[PDB]
Structures are given as C-alpha cells and as structure tokens.
Design a protein around this ligand. Structure first.
Ligand SMILES: CCCCCCCCCCCCO[C@@H]1O[C@H](CO)[C@@H](O[C@H]2O[C@H](CO)[C@@H](O)[C@H](O)[C@H]2O)[C@H](O)[C@H]1O
Ligand SMILES: CCCCCCCCCCCCO[C@@H]1O[C@H](CO)[C@@H](O[C@H]2O[C@H](CO)[C@@H](O)[C@H](O)[C@H]2O)[C@H](O)[C@H]1O
Lengths: 48, 240, 176
C-alpha cells in the first residue's frame, strides 16, 4: 500500500502512467493485422 | 576509417577540453579526474549495446557516437559541479555527494527518459532518409542511457572519494596547478563573479517585462518557421 | 518510377505521427517529474528557439538541412531540454522550500548558471577544430560544426533567459 501511498499523493504521475499505456495501445492498433482467427491454417507445399 | 579515427580523436579531445574546463571552474585536480573516466566508459560501453541490437560501425552510427559524447560530458559536469558546489557550501565530500544526488538524481532519470522519448521514435521514420535517422537515433539514445547510468553510479561516488573538503590544502597536484597556471586564474574568476551578478540583474529586469519577452518570442518562432522552410530541405549531401 | 524515386513515390510520411508522439511523450515524462500539467511547457516551449539559432548558422553559410545537420539540431535541442529541465526542477524545489516564485526562478538561474556555461564553452572550444583539420567527409563535419556553434550559443542564451520568464509566467496563472 506504500506503492499506492506514493501514487495517491502524486495523482499527475498516475494520470501520466495510464495515459502512456493508452497512447502505446492507440498507436499499436493500426499496426496490427486484421484477420479472422489467429494463424492456424497449416502451410502446404505443392510438387508438380 | 576516417570516421573511426574521428570518433577516437574527438573522444580524446572531448576528454582534454572537459578536464581543462573543470579545472577552470572547480579549480582542483580532484574533480578533473572523474569526467576523464566518465565519458570514455560511456561511449565505449555504447558499442556493447550496439552489438546486441545487430547494428554495425558505419559513417552514420559513428557520427551519432561523436554527437553523443557531448551529452555524456554534460552529465558528468552537472554531477560534479553540484558535488563541488556542495563542498563549497561547506559539506564533507561524502555528505556533499549525498545532498548533490538528492538534488539531481531523479531529475537525471527523467531527462534520460525524455531524451529517449525524442530520440527512439526517430528510428521508426520512413524512407532511406529514415533508415539513416535510425542509426543516428539508436546510437544517441543508447549512449544517453549508458551515460545516465554512469552519471548515477560512478561519477558521484568517485567525487565522494576523490574530492576532499575545500581549502584543506592545495596538495602536490593542486599546488602544481596553483603555481604553474595561476597565471590567468584570478582575473577571470572575478570577471565571472561580475558577469554572474550582471546575469541576475538582467533576468530580474526581464522577469518584470515578461510581456515584451513574450512579444519577441512571438514572431521569433514565426521567423523560425519561415526559415525552416526556406533553408534547403534534408537529404543525403554528396561528398568527394 | 524506379530506384529511390520509386521508394519516395511509395513511402509514407510517418514523421507526422513520429514528431507529435515524441513531443507529448516527453511532455508526459515531464508532467510526472514536475507533478504539473503546465510546468513542462517551461522546457518544451524554449526548444524551438535553439533550433532557429542552430539553423541560423546554415543561413550564415548557405548550406542545407541535410540529415546530418538535422540530427545535430535535434541533439542540441535535447541539450537545451536537459538544461531547462534541471533549472526548472531547481526552481520548483526552491519554491517548495518556502521561497516565492520569482525569487525561486532567479536563484535557480543563479545556481545553474555555472554548469551551463562550462559545458557550452567546452563545446565552443571544441568547435574550432570542426571547421578545419585533416581527414575526409569535410562536407559532413562542417555542416555539423557551424550549426553546433550557433546552436550552443542559442541553447545557453535562450535557456538562461526564456526559461525563467516562461517559468514565472506559467506559474503565475496557476496560483490564485
Ligand atoms: C476517453 C479517455 C481515454 C483516455 C484515457 C486516458 C486516461 C486518462 C486519465 C487522466 C485523467 C485526468 O488526470 C487528472 O487530471 C486532474 C485535473 O487536471 C489532475 O488534477 C490536478 O488538478 C487539480 C485541479 O482540478 C488539482 O486539484 C490537483 O491537485 C492536480 O493534481 C489529476 O491529478 C489527474 O489525475
Ligand atoms: C519512453 C520511451 C519512448 C519509447 C516509445 C517508442 C514509441 C515508438 C512509436 C513511434 C511512432 C509510431 O510510428 C509508427 O511507425 C510505424 C513503423 O512500424 C509505421 O508503420 C509503417 O511501417 C510498418 C513497418 O514496415 C508497416 O507495417 C506499416 O504498415 C507502416 O505504416 C506506422 O505508420 C507509425 O504509426
């Protein structure tokens, strides 16, 4: 609770931390590939 | 090859000059030691991390190293300016270092963090221009982090042991510099005092006429913009 | 299109989301250090001032804003950032020790005056070897050196003068 003790007396620090997390996620979303399902289709090789 | 020699030449230069500067301001052989150790082990240490991230020595990365030695020195100076200023206000060198790092320690990690905040995103720029920026940025940022670790661990400690209380006695080294190079010590220490005093006078008046300071900063930033777009753009400059 | 012209024609401009993301990121860190949403602007708002100054060296010469001088510009404004950060934190801590805002900023400038000038004079003494000497890549080393001179001059002058004005201005509209 000394962790929380430090943070409640420094609320701007807490806001900054939550905003940093939110910002990294916000810049991550456009970078992520949009598919249906994770990659589970097994790769195959054709020999002709 | 030339770039390599540059990165070593400048480094030794960066040592020599910095030690001169400290003996001019913190006039003791004691303090001059510690940036002489601080700035090499930083830049050289950079190489290790540069290896782990798969980079290579090249004109651009070594250029970034040459740029980064400067912030490395700057950290060393701030640390020992503060510790010897503690000794000046009359603290034992160990307690001097304690108070000094209480004053600037958490700052230093904050400035390392903001420097990373401005430098690391440069590695994700686009275009071959961006791939050059990437070498510059990564080299500078890892040098910043290593230099901050050095400024928080080795430099303050080495100040604590190396430096003794002010006055004490100008020792063998210190007596040598005192006699030999007291040639030009005093005139410009006292000129520095007078220039200081003028400085707080100037700020004290400007802190009264803050509206005019805002008025010049305005349209100075407009000149900055027009000049950002009239000075030629940025691409790789051709060389012999 | 072909070659690097083709790469230009297909590449995007991620700087338009790299520069802002950097800026506020620094802001966020400073906001945590100062415990203030406004005190960071004491540092940030002075860094475009050094840029012009450094850039002015190129206008002195007639060179170009090639990638090397661009990274040099960013580096010197980072140095300006660190100077401003340290003096601003010193002023704020002085205020926490019972001093008024204006005398705190005055005395913070007073304490930090010496380290800034010694760092800058060390650099500007290392700058003269960066307009002559021996070795190749002369265009690169030069186009960095002239800027480095003018930019360090701007760094010191505008830190030591604007940051106290910016600090006192910013802190007057939050104490009511
Ligand atoms: C849709 C939202 C999605 C993005 C979410 C990101 C998380 C957002 C969290 C940040 C919340 C706002 O952050 C919060 O701002 C307030 C108001 O300025 C700060 O408060 C500050 O100003 C107030 C004045 O009102 C003072 O009383 C206080 O001492 C001071 O800390 C808080 O210390 C900070 O925690
Ligand atoms: C506190 C320390 C700071 C550390 C924080 C680091 C923050 C880094 C964020 C930099 C800004 C994000 O910038 C992001 O760069 C990526 C590079 O992958 C760009 O991405 C671009 O190249 C990638 C990789 O080839 C492609 O997959 C993508 O389709 C394309 O848009 C994004 O368009 C941009 O959103």
């Amino acid at each position: 609770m000394d962790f929380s003790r430090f943070f409640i007396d420094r609320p701007i620090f807490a806001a900054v931390l939550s905003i940093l997390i939110f910002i990294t996620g916000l810049i991550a979303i456009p970078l992520l590939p949009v598919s249906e399902y994770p990659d589970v289709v097994p790769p195959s090789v054709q020999v002709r | 090859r030339d770039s390599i020699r540059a990165v070593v030449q400048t480094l030794l230069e960066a040592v020599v000059l910095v030690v001169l500067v400290v003996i001019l301001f913190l006039q003791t052989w004691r303090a001059s030691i510690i940036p002489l150790i601080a700035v090499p082990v930083s830049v050289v240490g950079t190489f290790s991390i540069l290896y782990l991230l798969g980079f290579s020595l090249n004109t651009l990365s070594l250029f970034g190293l040459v740029l980064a030695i400067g912030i490395v020195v700057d950290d060393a100076i701030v640390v020992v300016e503060n510790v010897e200023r503690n000794i000046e206000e009359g603290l034992a060198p160990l307690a001097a270092a304690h108070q000094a790092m209480r004053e600037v320690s958490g700052p230093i990690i904050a400035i390392a963090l903001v420097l990373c905040a401005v430098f690391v995103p440069m590695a994700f720029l686009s275009g071959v221009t961006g791939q050059f920026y990437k070498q510059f940025a990564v080299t500078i940022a890892i040098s910043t982090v290593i230099s901050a670790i050095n400024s928080l661990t080795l430099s303050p400690a080495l100040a604590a042991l190396l430096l003794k209380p002010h006055g004490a006695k100008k020792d063998l080294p210190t007596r040598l510099i005192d006699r030999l190079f007291g040639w030009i010590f005093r005139p410009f220490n006292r000129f520095f005092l007078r220039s200081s005093n003028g400085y707080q006078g100037l700020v004290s008046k400007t802190l009264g006429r803050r509206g005019a300071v805002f008025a010049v900063y305005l349209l100075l930033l407009c000149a900055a913009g027009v000049m950002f777009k009239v000075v030629p753009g940025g691409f790789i400059p051709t060389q012999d | 299109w072909t070659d690097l012209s083709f790469q230009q024609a297909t590449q995007g401009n991620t700087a338009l989301i790299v520069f802002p993301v950097a800026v506020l990121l620094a802001f966020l860190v400073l906001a945590a250090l100062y415990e203030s949403w406004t005190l960071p602007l004491a540092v940030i708002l002075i860094v475009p001032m050094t840029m012009l100054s450094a850039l002015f060296g190129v206008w002195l010469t007639g060179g170009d804003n090639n990638v090397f001088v661009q990274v040099g510009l960013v580096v010197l404004m980072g140095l300006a950032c660190k100077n401003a950060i340290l003096i601003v934190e010193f002023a704020r801590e002085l205020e926490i020790q019972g001093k008024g805002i204006m005398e705190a900023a005055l005395e913070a400038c007073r304490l930090r005056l010496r380290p800034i000038v010694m760092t800058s004079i060390a650099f500007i003494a290392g700058t003269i070897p960066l307009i002559l000497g021996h070795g190749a890549g002369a265009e690169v080393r030069g186009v960095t050196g002239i800027t480095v001179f003018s930019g360090m001059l701007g760094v010191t002058l505008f830190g030591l003068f604007l940051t106290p004005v910016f600090y006192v201005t910013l802190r007057k509209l939050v104490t009511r």
